[PDB]
Amino acid sequence: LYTPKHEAGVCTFYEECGKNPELSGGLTSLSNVSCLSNTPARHVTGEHLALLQRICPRLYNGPNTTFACCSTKQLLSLESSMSITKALLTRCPACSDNFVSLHCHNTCSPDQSLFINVTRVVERGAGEPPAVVAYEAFYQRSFAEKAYESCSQVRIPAAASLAVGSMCGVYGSALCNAQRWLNFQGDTGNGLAPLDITFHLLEPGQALPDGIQPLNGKIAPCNESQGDDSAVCSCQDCAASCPVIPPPEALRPSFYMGRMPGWLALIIIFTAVFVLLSAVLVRLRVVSNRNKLSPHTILGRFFQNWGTRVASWPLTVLALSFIVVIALAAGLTFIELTTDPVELWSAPKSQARKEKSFHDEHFGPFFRTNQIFVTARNRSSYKYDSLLLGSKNFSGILSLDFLLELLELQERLRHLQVWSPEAERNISLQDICYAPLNPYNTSLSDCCVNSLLQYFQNNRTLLMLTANQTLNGQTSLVDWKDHFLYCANAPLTFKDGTSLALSCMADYGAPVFPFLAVGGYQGTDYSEAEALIITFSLNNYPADDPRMAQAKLWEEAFLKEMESFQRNTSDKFQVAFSAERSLEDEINRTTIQDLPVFAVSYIIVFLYISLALGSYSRCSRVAVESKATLGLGGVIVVLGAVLAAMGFYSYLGVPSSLVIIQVVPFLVLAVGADNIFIFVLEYQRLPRMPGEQREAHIGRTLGSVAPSMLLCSLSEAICFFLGALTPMPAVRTFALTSGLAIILDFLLQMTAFVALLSLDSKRQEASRPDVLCKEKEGLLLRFFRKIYAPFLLHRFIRPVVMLLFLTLFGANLYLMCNINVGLDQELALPKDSYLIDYFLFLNRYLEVGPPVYFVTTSGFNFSSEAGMNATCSSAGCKSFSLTQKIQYASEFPDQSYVAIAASSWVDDFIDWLTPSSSCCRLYIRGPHKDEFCPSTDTSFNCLKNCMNRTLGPVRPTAEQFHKYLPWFLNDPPNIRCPKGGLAAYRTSVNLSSDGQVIASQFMAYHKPLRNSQDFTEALRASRLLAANITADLRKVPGTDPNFEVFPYTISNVFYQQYLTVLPEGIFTLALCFVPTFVVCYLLLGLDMCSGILNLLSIIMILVDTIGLMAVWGISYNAVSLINLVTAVGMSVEFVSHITRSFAVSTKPTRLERAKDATVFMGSAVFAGVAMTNFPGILILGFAQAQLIQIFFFRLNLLITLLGLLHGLVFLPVVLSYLGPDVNQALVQEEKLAS
C-alpha cells in the first residue's frame, strides 16, 4: 500500500483512472487523479513525443530514447489547467515556462520515484490499481528558491500589483516566499488544488533522510536569453537585470583650502607674524647699543587740580552722583525678558531663516510633539507558535495585561480638560489638536495620536477577540498577536487574511508605521521590541495668537498626569516622558536655583578688601583699623554702575535675559574692583610732609595713578564694544552692557569714591572709630624687596624662564588644533531632571531621526510630459529622477543621513489616474453628467473612465491634469481604491487660483542622531543632495532661471552656525587685539616697544588658554566665546600697569629699572587682581550645575593662573632685556625741579 522502490527508472503512477472521490463540492474543473502503478517507465514516441517536446523541451532526450510516465489525456488536462497561470504571467514568458516546467516534470518525469514518495492509498475498485489521494515530494532549497526568484517581482498585465501576490493565498506579496507559495499550490483547502502534495525544502548541505536524492534541474535566469529570441525580462519585471549604481565615494575632511590642510595655513600665517614683530624689537635695541610738554605732566597736573577740587566738596559730588545713578537705574520698570533658548542662541538673519519663512508661509507651521516611552521592569521573553508565521519570540512588554492598562492611560489623556481663566472655560483636546483630516468641524476621534493600539482602533472588545481557522492540515485559534504581526509588515491594508478580518488603519484615517509605534528592535523582528511609544501632536501658531496660551495650559495637565501615573506604577514598568515646552521651563529653573550662590560670592569679596586694606595693633583690633567703609563703598559703586547700564539699555528698548543678569555683575566686578584697591594702596604708601593738607595729598595721589586707570579702562571698554559683532543676541547684549558698564564705573570711581576716601581720612585723623561700632613697612614690600626680586632677576635664571615660556607657547600652539566644537543640551539640565532619563531613552530605543522635507519652489512646469518624466519614477522615467535619487541615497544611511525613502505625490497621482484601478470615474447619464463620481458610489450610473485605455506609460494632458488634480487631493482612501491624497498629500501641494502649482514637498526620515556632530553632518549631507537635485532639474527647458529646492527641518535654525570654516568667534577674537596696541602706543608717547610687548604678551596668554582648554576637554561654543572675550579684557590688568610703570622710570639702566617696577607695581597688582579674583571663583564650586562648573569655575581658574604666570614672571624678564629707553624729558624735568 506504498511504493517499495524509489531508486531510478521506475515510476509510481501512469494512467488516469477517474475522478477524486474524497473531494466533493468543488464544482470546478479538476484533473482526474491517477491510481498507483509501480512499474517501469513507458517509451514515448510519435505524436505523443511531439506533444511532450512541444510543451516542455527539458525532458527531450532524443528522437527514439525518450521515456516518460504520463499519458496524452493527462497532458491535455494539464494544458487546460495551466493555461490560467500561463495567461497571468504574460509579462516575461522566460520565467513562466520555468513554473510550467515544475508542473510537467512532476507529472511526466521518467525518474518519478527518486523524488516522489506516495503516502496515501484509497481502494477505488476490486482487482484495480488503488487511487492515491496524496503524496510527498522532495526538493533542494537552492533550486526552489532560485525558481521562485525568477518571477518573484513580476507584475500582472495591469502593472499595479505583483503576480506573486495573487498566488500566495491569505496574504499578498508582502509576506510570501518559496515554501509558502509551493504549499499554496498543493493545498486543496483553497478549492483549486486537485490533491495534497507535501513540499520538503531539504537543505543541500545536510542529507538527513537516507535513500532519497532531492532534485535540482535546469533553471533559466532573467538575463539569460533563450537562444536567439532576445526577449529577456526587463528589469522593471524581475530587477536582476538592472544596472549597478556605484556606491558614494569618500569625501575629504572639512576645513581645507588650496592644496594644504586649512588649519596648517593658519599656524604658519600666525607664527610668521609672531616672528616678524619680535625682530623689530631686537633691531631697536641694537640701534641703542650702537648709538650710545610730555603727556604725563599734563595728565598729572589736570588730575591733581580735579582731585583736590572734588576732595574739597565731598557732599555735593556724592549727592549729584547718587542722583544720576538712581535716575538711570529707574529704567528697569520697562524690562522685557526673552526666555526661548533658540531665539537667544541663534543668528537672526541667515539662509535658514529665509527657508523657514518660506515654508511657514506656504505650508503652515510645524507641529508640536508630546511623547512618552514605557518599558517593562521585570519579565521574561516567551514564545508563541502561530499557524501563519511559526515560532516567534515575544518580549515581556508585549504581554496582554499591560496593553489594557496602557489603553486606560491613553483614554484618560484624550478626554482631559483644563480651566482657562481668560476664556473662563474648559479647554478640550479637539480645540487645539493637530489633525491631518477634517481641520474644521472636527471631533475628538480625528485628533492625531500614534500608538500600537491604533492597529485595533482603540476598541477594547476587538483586542480580546479570538477565532478558529484551518490552514492545510492544522486547525487552531488566532488572536491579537497574529493581527499585530500581520499589520506590522503591511501597514496599509483594509482587512487581514485571517478569520479576524479587521482593518489595520488608524481611526483618524491614516496608516501607522512600525517605527512610530514600537522601538528597540533590530531588522524586521518587530515582536522582539522592548519599548512602547505614545505620541500626541498639537498645532503650532503665531506667537500673537491667544490660542497658544490655551495649548500651553493643556501641556501642564499632561505633565501632572504622567507624574501621578509614575508614582502609581512604580514597580511594574519604567516610564520616560516629555512635553514640548519642558526644555524652555527646565533651563530657566536652573538659573533661579543658582542666583543666591552668586550673591554670596559678592559679599565674600567685600570681606577680603576690609582685611587687605586694613591694619592691626598686635592682635584683635579689627573694630578700629579694618576698612569696612571702603569695602562697602567700592562694592556699592560698582554694582550701582552695573544697574545703571542695565536701566539705560532698558530705556532704549533692548531686551535681555536671565543669563545676562546672572553673569554680568560678576565679570564686571572682577575687573572694576582692582582700580579701587590699587588707588587705596598707593594712598596708604605715600607719606606727606608737615604743612600739607589731606586734600593736596589726595590730589597728588590721583595725579600719580590716574593715567594707568585711564589707559586700562579705555582698552577694556573698546575691546568689549568690539565684542558686539557676532549676530547671536545673548553675546551682543552681553558685550554692549559690559562696555557701557565699565565706562560708567570709571566715571564714578574718579568722583564719588575720591569724596568717600576724603571723608574716611577726615574721620581717621580725628581718632574716631568707623560707624561699624606707626607707618611700618608692610610684609609684601619687605618680601618682594628682599626675597623675590633679587632671585627672579638673577643672572643664571632669566634665559631658563625665557626658554620655558617659549616652549610652552609652542606646545600650546600645536595643541590648539584639537578643538571639540558644539553645544550639547545634556549639560544645561540639573543633575536630577527627568529630561535626562528622557534623552537616555531616546538615545537607546528610537529607531528613526527627525523628518526632513525637500521643498520645491515655484518655476517648474509639472503639467508637461518633460516635467512628469523628470520627477516620478514609473516605467518610462529617467534613471536618475528626483524620487530615484532620494531612494538611492536612502540605501547608504551612513554616508548620507537618510534612512527611509521619500514618498512622492506625482507617482501616487499617476497611479490613481490608471483606468484599471477604477478610481477616477464619471457619471454617464442624468443631472450630474461629466461630474466627478466618487469611488464609493455603487450605482450603475457611472461606466466611463477619466482616461481612455492605452499602452505603455500613462500621461495626462494639461487640461486633464489641471482639472483632475483637485479631485485627487481630496479623495479619502477606502477598500475599493487604496490610493488617494487626502490622508497624505492634502497639504503638500499648494495650488493657485488658475490651477498652477506654487510649491510642493517630498517627505523623508533621517537615521537616528545622537549628538551635535551628527546633526551637523546630517545638515551637510542633506544640503549636498538638494544641490545635486536642483543642478539637474534646472536643465529642463521652460523652467525659471531661479528655480531651486531646499531641505527644511525644524532643527536647522540652531545648528547652521557650525557649518563654517572658522567657528564664528575667531574673526571677532582676532579683531579684539588691536585696541591694546593702539591705546598703549598712543597714550605712552608713540613708544613702539611698549605697544609691541603688550600685544605679544596678550597673544601668548590667549594661545595658552585655548591650548589648555583643548587638553582639559572643554568644548568651544558661544559661552566659551563670552569667557574668552572676558579673558582678553582682564589680561590688560596684568600687563599694562607693569608696562607703564617700567616706562615711566628715571633709573639709568634697564636692569635697575625693572627691579623697582617689579617690587612696587608687582606687589600692588598681585595683592589686588589675583586675590580679588580667587575668592569669587572658588565659591562657585557649589553651583550645582554642569554649565557653570565647566565653563565658569575651571575656565576662570585657568585664565587667572595663566595671567599671573605671564604677568609677574615672564614680563619682568622680557622688559629687562628688550624694554624701552629712558625718557630724557622726564630726566630734565626731574633735575630742574630741584
Ligand X SMILES: CC(C)CCC[C@@H](C)[C@H]1CC[C@H]2[C@@H]3CC=C4C[C@@H](O)CC[C@]4(C)[C@H]3CC[C@]12C
Ligand Y SMILES: *[C@@H]1O[C@H](CO)[C@@H](O[C@@H]2O[C@H](CO)[C@@H](O)[C@H](O)[C@H]2NC(C)=O)[C@H](O)[C@H]1NC(C)=O
**Long-range contact list for 800-808, CB < 8 A, 24+ apart?**
801/1209, 801/1210, 801/1213, 802/1210, 802/1213, 802/1214, 805/1100, 805/1206, 805/1209, 805/1210, 808/1104
Torsion of CA 1020, 1022, 1026, 1029, to 10 degrees: 120
CA distances 629 to 278, 666, 694, 724, 763, Å, are: 47, 21, 18, 36, 11
Residue 69 and residue 51: Cα distance in Å, rounded? 14
Of 1016, 1076, 1093, the closest CA to residue 1049 belongs to 1016
Note whether 61 and 162 are within 8 A (CB).
no
Pick the closer one to ligand Y by CB: 358 or 608.
358
396 binds ligand NAG (CB under 6 A): no
Q: How far is the CB of 404 from ligand Y (least distance, A)?
A: 14
Q: How far apart are CA 951 and CA 949, in angstroms?
A: 7
SS3 129: coil
**Rounded Cα distance, 809 and 806, in Å:** 5
**Residues 6 or more apart in contact with residue 27 via CB below 8 angstroms:** none
Mask of contacts with ligand NAG, 1107-1146, x by CB under 6 A? ----------------------------------------
CB of 346 to ligand X, least distance (A): 8
Which range touches ligand X (CB under 6 A), out of 341-349, 639-647, 757-765, 1108-1116? 341-349
Rounded-to-integer distance, Cα 380 and Cα 400, Å: 14
Note whether 892 binds ligand NAG by CB under 6 A. Answer: no
468 interacts with, out of ligand NAG, ligand Y, ligand X, none, CB within 5 to 8 A per kind: ligand Y
- If binding is defined by CB under 6 A, does position 298 make contact with ligand NAG? no
Which one of the spans 217-225, 279-287, 337-345, 498-506 is the region binding ligand X (CB under 6 A)? 337-345
Number of residues that this document lists for the chain: 1234
Quick note: the x/- pattern for ligand NAG over 4-23, rule CB under 6 A, is --------------xx----
Shorter beta-carbon distance to ligand NAG: residue 29 or 767? 29
284, 267, 303: which is closest to 1091 by C-alpha?
Answer: 284
- The reply to whether 206 sits near ligand NAG by the rule CB under 6 A is no
Q: Which of 1050, 1088, 1151, 1170 binds ligand X (CB under 6 A)?
A: 1050
Find cell 518559496 and name the residue.
Answer: 178
Q: Total binding residues for ligand Y by CB under 6 A? A: 16
Q: Does 864 engage in binding with ligand Y (CB under 6 A)?
A: yes
Residue 926 partner contact from ligand Y, ligand X, ligand NAG, none using kind-dependent CB cut-offs of 5 to 8 Å = none
Q: In what order do the strands lie in the sheet with 932-933?
A: 932-933, 921-922, 944-945
Indicate the residue type of 452. Answer: L
Q: Is 37 in the site for ligand NAG (CB under 6 A)?
A: no
Q: Look up residue 947 and give its three cell numbers.
A: 482616461
What does the per-residue mask of binding to ligand X show for 1051-1090, with x meaning CB under 6 A? x--x------------------------------------
470 binds, among ligand NAG, ligand Y, ligand X, none (CB under 5 to 8 A by kind): none
Stretch 397-426 residues interacting with ligand NAG (CB under 6 A)? 417, 425-426
Q: Which stretch binds ligand NAG (CB under 6 A): 112-120, 608-616, 854-862, 1101-1109?
A: 112-120
Mask for 316-355, x = binds ligand Y (CB under 6 A): ----------------------------------------
Q: From residue 422 to residue 461, what is the string marking binding to ligand NAG with x (rule CB under 6 A)? A: ---xx-----------------------------------
Q: Which residue type sits at 152?
A: S
How far CA 70 is from CA of 56, 82, 123, 749, 1071, in Å, comes to 13, 16, 21, 117, 96
Q: Within a 13 Å sphere around the CA of 984, how many CA atoms are in the beta-carbon half? A: 21
Least distance (Å) between residue 960 CB and ligand NAG: 7
By CB under 6 A, the residues from 586 to 605 that bind ligand Y are: none
CA angle 908–1019–841, rounded 5-degree value: 85
Stretch that binds ligand NAG, among 29-37, 60-68, 623-631, 1161-1169 (CB under 6 A): 29-37
Contact between 610 and 293 under an 8 Å Cβ cutoff? The reply is no
Chain breaks in the chain (C to N over 2.5 A) after: 292, 773
As measured in angstroms, the least distance from the Cβ of 850 to ligand X is 4
* Segment interacting with ligand Y (CB under 6 A) among 94-102, 328-336, 460-468, 961-969: 460-468
Return the ∠ at Cα 762 (arms to 759 and 764), rounded to 5°: 110
Distance (Å, whole) CA 426 – CA 417: 6
Residue that has been written with the C-alpha cell 590688568 in this structure? 1133
Which of 166, 190, 223, 271 lies at the binding interface for ligand NAG (CB under 6 A)? 223
CB of 1058 to ligand X, least distance (A): 12
Give which of ligand NAG, ligand X, ligand Y, none residue 209 binds (C-beta under 5 to 8 Å, depending on kind).
Answer: ligand NAG
Q: How far is the CB of 20 from ligand NAG (least distance, A)?
A: 9
571 near ligand NAG, judged by CB under 6 A:
yes
Question: Are the C-beta atoms of residues 419 and 426 closer than 8 Å to each other?
Answer: yes
Q: Is 704 in the site for ligand Y (CB under 6 A)?
A: no
- How is residue 704 written as a grid cell? 600719580
CB of 823 to ligand X, least distance (A): 6
Considering only CA atoms, which of 1030, 988, 1036 is closest in space to residue 863?
1036
Per partner kind, with CB cut-offs from 5 to 8 A, the member of ligand X, ligand NAG, ligand Y, none near residue 990 is ligand Y
1176 vs 1199: CA distance, rounded Å: 14
Contacts of 889 (CB under 8 A, 6+ apart): 896, 898, 1025
Piece in contact with ligand NAG (CB under 6 A), picked from 375-383, 497-505, 806-814, 1001-1009: 375-383
Strand order in the sheet with 196-202: 116-118, 134-140, 196-202
Q: Which is nearer to ligand X, 893 or 934 (CB)?
A: 893
Shortest approach of ligand NAG to residue 865 CB, angstroms?
4
160 binds ligand Y (CB under 6 A): no
Q: Which of 150, 863, 1000, 1120 binds ligand Y (CB under 6 A)?
A: 863
Residue 198 main-chain phi, psi, to 5 deg? -95, 125
Q: Considering CB distances under 5 to 8 angstroms, the limit depending on partner class, which of ligand Y, ligand X, ligand NAG, none binds residue 1111? A: none
Q: Which three cell numbers stand for residue 953?
A: 506609460
Rg, C-alpha atoms of the chain:
44
Q: For the CB of residue 587, give the shortest distance to ligand X in the complex, in Å.
A: 7
The partner in contact with residue 801, picked from ligand NAG, ligand X, ligand Y, none with C-beta cut-offs of 5 to 8 angstroms by kind, is: none
CB 866 within 8 A of CB 398: no
Q: Does 362 bind ligand Y (CB under 6 A)?
A: yes
Check: CB of residue 827 under 8 Å from CB of residue 1186: yes
* Among positions 280, 607, 958, 975, the unique one binding ligand Y when judged by CB under 6 A: 958
Question: Binding pattern to ligand Y, positions 991-1030, x when CB under 6 A?
Answer: -----x-x--------------------------------
How many alpha carbons lie under 13 Å from residue 459 in its C-beta half-sphere?
Answer: 14
Which candidate, 660, 595, 740, places its Cα nearest to that of 1119?
Answer: 660
Q: Which three cell numbers stand for residue 317?
A: 559730588
Q: Which residues bind ligand X (CB under 6 A)?
A: 341-342, 345, 369, 823, 825, 850, 1050-1051, 1054
Binding site for ligand NAG (CB under 6 A): 2, 18-19, 29-30, 32, 77, 117-119, 209, 212, 221, 223, 240, 378, 381, 383, 391, 393, 417, 425-426, 568, 571, 865-866, 869, 876, 947-948, 1028, 1031-1032
What residues make contact with ligand Y under the rule CB under 6 A? 361-362, 364, 459, 461-462, 467-468, 477, 861, 863-864, 958, 990, 996, 998
